Design a protein around this ligand. Structure first.
Ligand SMILES: [Mg+2]
Length: 183
């Protein structure tokens, strides 16, 4: 266990990458060290803790990791998305804002940001994120539906309506209009 410690590190990270998160916890717990901080071990063990229900230990390792490596978009993403999931929206929002700007092709982040903003009552900001998300994925019914709800809350029924109708059209399946549009 310098050699054994390298074995558990590499194997543990391997497991975390693969989604074998229980096993990743069992192995990376043997190598993690708060006071000789290794951000790859802490990030992957943080993820694995969050995925196995140890959300408080996980968000701890991830805050520590993000304090150590403020550049780490991977770390900021899982921490932001985790906070969204546990509904700590005051924490989630600034992380997701910063990740969305660092990584503008990440649709899930932009959507989840818009959903959070909507749930805080920041309907204008939500609408702005949902429009960005639709620019990434124009045929995601769930975004058309989310943005229609935000417009409606602001009394913008005229603007909501086309998005409502699109959401319901996409639920059924294919838009017949595309029969007439060249590719
Ligand atoms: Mg709402």
């Amino acid at each position: 266990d310098d050699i054994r410690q390298v074995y558990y590190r590499d194997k543990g990270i391997s497991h975390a990458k693969a989604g074998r998160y229980s096993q990743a916890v069992m192995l990376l717990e043997q190598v993690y060290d708060a006071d000789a901080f290794d951000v790859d071990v802490a990030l992957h063990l943080g993820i694995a803790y969050v995925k196995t229900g140890a959300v408080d230990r996980g968000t701890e390792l991830l805050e520590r990791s993000l304090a150590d490596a403020p550049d780490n978009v991977k770390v900021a993403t899982v921490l932001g998305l985790t906070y969204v999931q546990v509904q700590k929206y005051d924490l989630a929002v600034p992380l997701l804002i910063k990740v969305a700007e660092a990584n503008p092709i990440n649709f899930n982040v932009r959507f989840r940001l818009g959903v959070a903003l909507d749930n805080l009552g920041r309907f204008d900001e939500a609408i702005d994120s949902f429009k960005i998300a639709l620019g990434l994925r124009p045929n995601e019914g769930k975004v058309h539906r989310a943005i229609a709800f935000s417009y409606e809350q602001m009394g913008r029924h005229e603007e909501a309506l086309p998005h409502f109708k699109k959401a319901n059209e996409l639920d059924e399946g294919a838009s017949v209009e595309l029969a007439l549009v060249p590719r």
